Structure 1
Amino acid sequence: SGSGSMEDFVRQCFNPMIVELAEKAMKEYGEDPKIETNKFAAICTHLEVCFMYSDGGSKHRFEIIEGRDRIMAWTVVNSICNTTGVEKPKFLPDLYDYKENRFIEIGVTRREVHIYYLEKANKIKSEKTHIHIFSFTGEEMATKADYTLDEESRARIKTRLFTIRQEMASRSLWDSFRQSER
């Protein structure tokens, strides 16, 4: 589901490190990036947001968990849980917030945000894990309506997501993409 024009877009739009991390994530499930090109973009976007979110508070307020191999990912997680004694999650989250001492799952959606907020809450079966959704239309939604970052930072993120929708639109990739969301 998608085009080599979408493939080309991904390679032009996203930082090479992000591109390679997504190619690796997909291949680990037997998916081919130059075929399932809508997932390629989807995975790339979720990564970029995660990295943007981490560089949004103070220095080293967040530990990044997404983008890491499973062993290092669980190394970080297991260590944080030892140093802080917070309930160890059953699935790998995306960040840890040292300041509010909780994990964060981050969602990015091309549908309505309330819908994606539940599927996460149900899959993550989040005990103490904080959830935070974003859309490409400027919608956001967080646990107990706690948005963690300041607005200048949250807006830096929403504006980037908007930016991507548009560039996709000009290239006529957006509906396929909006359509293909499982």
Structure 2
Amino acid sequence: RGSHMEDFVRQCFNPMIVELAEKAMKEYGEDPKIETNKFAAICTHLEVCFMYSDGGSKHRFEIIEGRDRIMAWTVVNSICNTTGVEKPKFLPDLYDYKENRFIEIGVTRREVHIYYLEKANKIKSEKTHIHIFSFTGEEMATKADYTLDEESRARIKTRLFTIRQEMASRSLWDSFRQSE
């Protein structure tokens, strides 16, 4: 299939993230060799969720994204049946042991207002916290509770702009922006 996008994704992202994104797409019936704009997106979403869980305490967060569909649901079942939190209708990305809430992490190429609105409309009940990031450095969280301190969030924003820069340098940012 070739694709300059696929070669950049493997050269830019972590091999474990590329493997986990590859498993995620094939689990849902999509091939990273054609859906290359997607391929770069789940890799970006995966890394952001991992940087997010790294922020704060060495514990604090339980990672839901990156697991198999069955295993990820088994964890939220244990989390709900232990803390009494209501079962989310859709698979979240993390769970905050410090704030007792699930987190839905979003990485968009639009403004943070639309993606939040689409995610909040799909999110069954506003119990699950929503945190949105953008490739332009913007961010938006539920009730302005951004969970982490400014330092950890600033690097996620910095890492996002480096990906956008490396992609525009390879003439791949235009097709990536007009695909979401």
CA 175–126 in structure 1, closer or farther in 2 if over 3 Å, else same: farther
Q: Deviations over 1:110-169 (max 9, x none)?
A: 111100001111112343000000000000000001100001100011000001000001
Partners in 2 of 1:126 and 1:98 — Cα distance? 19
**Which residue in the other structure is 2:51 paired with?**
52
Q: Is the 8 A contact 1:64 1:96 kept in 2?
A: yes
Worse-superposed segment, 76-85 or 171-180? 76-85
Q: Deviations over 1:84-127 (max 9, x none)?
A: 10111111100000001100000000111100001111112343
Partners in 1 of 2:58 and 2:22 — Cα distance? 29
Worse-superposed segment, 50-59 or 29-38? 29-38
**Which residue in the other structure is 1:136 paired with?**
135
Computed over aligned residues only, the root mean square deviation of the Cα atoms, in angstroms, reads: 1.0
Partners in 2 of 1:62 and 1:126 — Cα distance? 21
Runs of 4+ in structure 1 deviating by more than 3 angstroms, as ranges, are none
Partners in 1 of 2:28 and 2:96 — Cα distance? 29
How far off its partner does 1:52 sit? 0.4
Count of matched residue pairs: 178
How far off its partner does 1:31 sit? 1.5
Partners in 1 of 2:30 and 2:64 — Cα distance? 22
Q: Mark the runs of 5 or more structure 1 residues left unpaired by the alignment.
A: none
How far off its partner does 1:71 sit? 2.1
TM-score in terms of structure 1 length: 0.95
Partners in 2 of 1:123 and 1:111 — Cα distance? 17
Partners in 1 of 2:119 and 2:80 — Cα distance? 21
Partners in 1 of 2:34 and 2:139 — Cα distance? 30
Q: Is the 8 A contact 1:91 1:124 kept in 2?
A: yes
Worse-superposed segment, 167-176 or 79-88? 79-88
TM-score in terms of structure 2 length: 0.96
Worse-superposed segment, 149-158 or 122-131? 122-131
Worse-superposed segment, 109-118 or 17-26? 17-26
Q: Is the 8 A contact 1:89 1:127 kept in 2?
A: no
Worse-superposed segment, 71-80 or 172-181? 71-80
Q: Identity percentage over the alignment?
A: 100
How far off its partner does 1:70 sit? 1.8
Q: Is the 8 A contact 2:88 2:124 kept in 1?
A: no
Secondary structure in structure 1 of the residue aligned to 2:132: strand
Partners in 2 of 1:147 and 1:124 — Cα distance? 18
Partners in 1 of 2:91 and 2:122 — Cα distance? 11
**Which residue in the other structure is 1:97 paired with?**
96
